[PDB]
Symmetry: C4
């Protein structure tokens, strides 16, 4: 209810998102024989958002994502004045989580952030499945837009109350089940940033893409909902 509480909720939320989703990818996805694969990473990402949106969603709205904050602005749901502090809160929470993750991951012989990719988002030569820039662009635009659309709908005043964290968290699992092979799945500029920093090379070079594409997608989803679906 006071902005210090809200920005703390948002850094904790984005922290948890980065630590849990990227942690699952770095520590467990590829573990020999028993590892969780892409489906387990998708689940982990979506569960970070589900659990935190229930935990701190009644404090801050529970965005944990710059593209979500901006998209909700665009959809007429969030004040332009509050946007920048949220985004900074998210970027900070994210970076702390990646630093801790980097520390933990380093306690294993042979760990190499730069060479492994550190769960970084890339396209072209740095796409996991060798998808071109155009494939990356279209998937991130659609998934960002739909994500915002689901966020708008599930938090609409005519939506039964309480269930939004479930709709929204599971939307993020969905989004990763589809798009990890294309881009390692972003839809979240703060998550891309936290991780790019420690990968240190190409992730930092391509980083601009995973800022503008999700934000543009998020605005589009907000606008479609606001203009086509809301009233009544």
């Amino acid at each position: 209810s006071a902005m210090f509480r809200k920005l703390a909720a948002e850094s904790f939320g984005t922290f948890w998102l980065v630590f849990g989703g990227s942690g699952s990818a770095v520590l467990a996805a590829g573990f020999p024989e028993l590892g969780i694969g892409f489906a387990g990473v998708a689940l982990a990402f979506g569960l970070t958002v589900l659990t935190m949106a229930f935990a701190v969603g009644h404090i801050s709205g529970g965005h944990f994502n710059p593209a979500v904050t901006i998209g909700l602005w665009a959809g007429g749901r969030f004040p332009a004045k509050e946007v920048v502090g949220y985004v900074i809160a998210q970027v900070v929470g994210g970076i702390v989580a990646a630093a801790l993750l980097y520390l933990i991951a380093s306690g294993k012989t042979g760990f190499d952030a730069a060479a492994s990719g550190f769960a970084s988002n890339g396209y072209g030569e740095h796409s996991p499945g060798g998808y071109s820039m155009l494939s990356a662009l279209v998937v991130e635009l659609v998934l960002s837009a739909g994500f915002l659309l689901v966020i708008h709908g599930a938090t609409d005043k005519f939506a039964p109350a309480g269930f939004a964290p479930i709709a929204i968290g599971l939307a993020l699992t969905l989004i990763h089940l589809i798009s990890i092979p294309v881009t390692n799945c972003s839809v979240n500029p703060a998550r891309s940033t936290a991780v790019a920093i420690f990968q240190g090379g190409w992730a930092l070079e391509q980083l601009w893409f995973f800022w503008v594409v999700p934000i543009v997608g998020g605005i589009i989803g907000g606008l479609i909902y606001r203009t086509l679906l809301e009233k009544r």
Copy 2:
């Protein structure tokens, strides 16, 4: 509440269903070592319906499926007058999503819609597990009927409110966990259609099957609920 809103909700919903479920199948199911398999595809399909039914379900009823619209007509829940616009809305949303998916998938060297099947529904020689037409027929009839039955029950007036998108989305995950090996799992004529178009050959030839079988199953489920379980 106005029919333009509703038909837009239904094309967005069916779009999301096609993009997410078939996207997960085309981009991620078979990915080397880390791919999501049939269980991840089943989950993705069911999550498209869960997330969209929460998002736009309070606008359109959230059918996203011709066999569901027709089945709810049969069960006395949906007006015959509204049926055709829903079905067209669903077929259109579906086809746009498949076109986008086709674009994304094409950004990978070696992609071949026709040869891979493009997540198309087939039986006999085009069943994934080599199941005969009779196996295809019985599974789609039962799963379509049960699906409609769950949709009817979970949206019954005596069902606790709010939870239907969860019951219904998870019913679709269930349905795919069972039947992907038989038919690649349809229960949805609009999803079969969107994808058949781009596969281009046998999917278009067998396409008639995945229209009539789900619709017949859906009507049967609506009738059983209406006639045997509703009153009271």
Copy 3:
């Protein structure tokens, strides 16, 4: 509300349970490279109960399981007069689903119910992991008891309303994640029966075990809840 509705809900429910859970095991669990494994079977089983308990739970109580009906009798929640019709309804629904499953499965070259086991519950030489009779006995007793305990608690008058189908369905997923290697996981005499019939040999010989053990476990869980946890 009228007993014909209730017994129909219970046969449909138990049918769905058998068709979906055993169907997933027979058609999809072992599918080459992409199959769902034991985790996908566990999920499918639990989703049958979740989706049907939401669908028809407000009609019949949504037991779908003889050990649950008897256990709820023992826990003081269900009248002894209604028990036998429920159990028959469940056994009938179950057997129809197994017959349909048998038909579908037969549409694949090389299918052999008897040799594959047809998802039958066995111990000793017919345990999937080679577990002895004593291992089978202890796991089924504990899991049946806990299952009844969760059913009692989640449907207690002080439990927030609406959520029981989620608690109960996910309890069944849990129970299969643990015990498929020991017995192929029963906790449900009607599911064991439907499937034993078509396996035709040893499943029919060991069948007596998967009647008495779950029922005894279910009564124990009902009694613990009734006597130790209920009041207040």
Copy 4:
């Protein structure tokens, strides 16, 4: 409402947690070809807490974990007077479940608790992925703190009612998806203890770590919530 009921709920809860989560790990995680892997263990752990928190959460608060009881004390949510009986109840429930599990597991030829590890928590040479003590320390501190933070938030008075068992159970699945490779994932001193006893060697030697680290993390999460996020 009476302390005998509450302590019984807590031993049953912790019992179920140990039996189900560690059972899934011992009986099913590594099963040839069809086994559940780390993702299935993570799911099983989280489902024990989800199902029991719905079942007995309205009786005892549904902690099932010493680090949760202590963390809720620290967060101003639970009386210091009730703490010790809860912790004993949890340790007892846990140990009974591990003993039963040990009995079941012994019914398979070649079973070796000591050599397999019996799902025990270890670091360094006894980490599953060869993670050092410092990696173990940082992951358990963060995950324990976040877990307490989610428990605090989801049970806050401004959180929609009913949903906490879902937020909290799925937080535990999350936590295991991340950290099984580092420590076999504890965040729960009673679960570590029950299992260490039967592993018999190094698990007992390292056991002190998985008491103090989770408890410290839990207190930290309680304090952050109490001091930074609660009011309003």
